[PDB]
């Protein structure tokens, strides 16, 4: 009975340790998923901003007609 009381100790401790480590790994996976959104969004913002700026530049250039004094 004592050796069973102790083997269940070992078993419970190990089947808790492993679940804890797997939880840590899942948390790291979530952290990387989160980090991905930064490079997903900053690039979108910079793309839209380049679009706006270069469109405004095209406009300002094209807005040169004739003077006719």
């Amino acid at each position: 009975t004592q050796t069973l009381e102790l083997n269940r100790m070992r078993g419970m401790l190990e089947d808790d340790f492993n679940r804890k480590k797997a939880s840590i790994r899942q948390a790291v996976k979530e952290e990387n998923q989160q980090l991905d959104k930064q490079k997903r969004d900053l690039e979108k913002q910079s793309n839209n901003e380049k679009l706006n700026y270069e469109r405004t530049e095209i406009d300002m250039v094209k807005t040169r007609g004739q003077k006719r004094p």
Binding site: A22, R25, Q26, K29
Partner: protein
């Protein structure tokens, strides 16, 4: 602790691999996202959460690798296992064997090494190469040689889509097929000749689809390969380890070119009027008409027949059926092989592909026959070669890429020496 490594070089290879990964993911309860809503043989867990496949996808035309990079499986494969170059193979062997691959083989082999470092019970390799093309021929044979000089003892299978007998898909196909057949003679342990002409016939007659397309063809190829690998993957009352084929079907060291077959490939409503017992299913299995390759086994001798059954199968009827099929006089074996059968059993019934033309049935058989009639194919193919080498046609597109011309000669002559084996082994003692 038992797994494989599947390579899909060339153009047809990546297609049949797409269909095969579809089938594998769908039977294993693996979502196309790589997350589950047996896989140690093919897939691998990324520590936690999702699965990733064991494969490398080579090509030089970035077309198909891109199409899979943004298709339905964009989020399944490791983006380092999809190697697409810049220029194209252009159907000439030397383009994918001396100039382009000359350095791409370094990256591909380093990725193969990094994969094999993670495998724990690796058994063998499953390569795929449409030899009629350029990159699947050149790069494929070069990888074959590189692995045979790198690893060694590990087995090397193959599922080659040779040029059809009659229908034409290219004009230079005899050259870059003969070259790869000469470069594949020794480095590969088992060659399973697949031909897009017999399967067109089948899909036309049995499956009743009048206007088939490489999609359905590749579905069928995936079904064949899954019925082959069910031994390793799932349970079976009599299992075979892939190293079985390397020693049951290769009598002499050079001759290892066999042809495959599957049963029962019947549409739904056409099989609804059928009981499909082991007797009739195995009597249809040997039918020369529905062989995956193209030949006339009734005009040749057999040498070895592996037969993997899957589904709820009763063994007594298996043995009875094989006895009665060895009774036939039209089907005869050679003198030096009296025990001309090798069977296996897997309890896993066939899995249907959702949206597939194939019908669901409990008992299925997959046969791999090392025969001697397939020999004539090479002859016929060699035929074509001569009618081109008689005037050195198209050779400048090959001599321009560093390939020494004389190679051609040697290959076509040395491949002809295969006959010295074939027409010899067909002769009794």
């Amino acid at each position: 602790m038992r797994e494989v490594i599947s390579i899909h070089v060339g153009q047809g290879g990546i297609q049949v691999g797409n269909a095969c990964w579809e089938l594998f993911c769908l039977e294993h309860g693996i979502q196309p996202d790589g997350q589950m809503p047996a896989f140690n043989t093919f897939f691998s867990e990324t520590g936690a959460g999702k699965h990733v496949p064991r494969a490398v996808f080579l090509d030089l035309e970035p077309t198909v690798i891109d199409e899979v990079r943004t298709g339905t499986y964009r989020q399944l494969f490791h983006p380092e296992q999809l190697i697409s170059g810049k220029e194209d193979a252009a159907n000439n062997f030397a383009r994918g064997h001396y100039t382009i691959g000359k350095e791409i083989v370094d990256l591909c082999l380093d990725r193969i090494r990094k994969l094999a470092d993670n495998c724990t019970g690796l058994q063998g390799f499953l390569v795929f190469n449409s030899v009629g093309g350029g990159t699947g021929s050149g790069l494929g044979s070069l990888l074959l040689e590189r692995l045979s000089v790198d690893y060694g003892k590990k087995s090397k299978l193959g599922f080659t889509i040779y040029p059809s007998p009659q229908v034409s898909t290219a004009v230079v196909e005899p050259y870059n097929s003969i070259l790869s057949t000469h470069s594949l003679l020794e480095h590969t342990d088992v060659a399973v000749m697949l031909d897009n002409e017999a399967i067109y016939d089948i899909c036309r007659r049995n499956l009743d689809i009048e206007r088939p397309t490489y999609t359905n063809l590749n579905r069928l190829i995936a079904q064949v390969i899954s019925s082959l690998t069910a031994s390793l993957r799932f349970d079976g009352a009599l299992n075979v380890d892939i190293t079985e084929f390397q020693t049951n079907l290769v009598p002499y060291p050079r001759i290892h070119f066999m042809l495959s077959s599957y049963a029962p490939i019947i549409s739904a409503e056409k099989a609804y009027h059928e009981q499909l017992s082991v007797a009739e299913i195995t009597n249809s299995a040997f039918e020369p008409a529905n062989m995956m390759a193209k030949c006339d086994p009734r005009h040749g001798k057999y040498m070895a027949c592996s037969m993997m059954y899957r589904g709820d199968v009763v063994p007594k009827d298996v043995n009875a059926s094989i006895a009665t099929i060895k009774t036939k006089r039209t089907i005869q074996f050679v003198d030096w092989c009296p025990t001309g059968f090798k069977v296996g059993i897997n309890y896993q019934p066939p899995t249907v592909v959702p949206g597939g033309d194939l019908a669901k049935v409990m008992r299925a058989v997959c046969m791999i026959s090392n025969s001697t009639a397939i020999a004539e194919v090479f002859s016929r193919l060699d035929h074509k070669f001569d009618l081109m080498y008689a005037k050195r046609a198209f050779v400048h597109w090959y001599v321009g890429e560093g390939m020494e011309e004389g190679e051609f000669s040697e290959a076509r002559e040395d491949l002809a020496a295969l006959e010295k084996d074939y027409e010899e082994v067909g002769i009794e003692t």
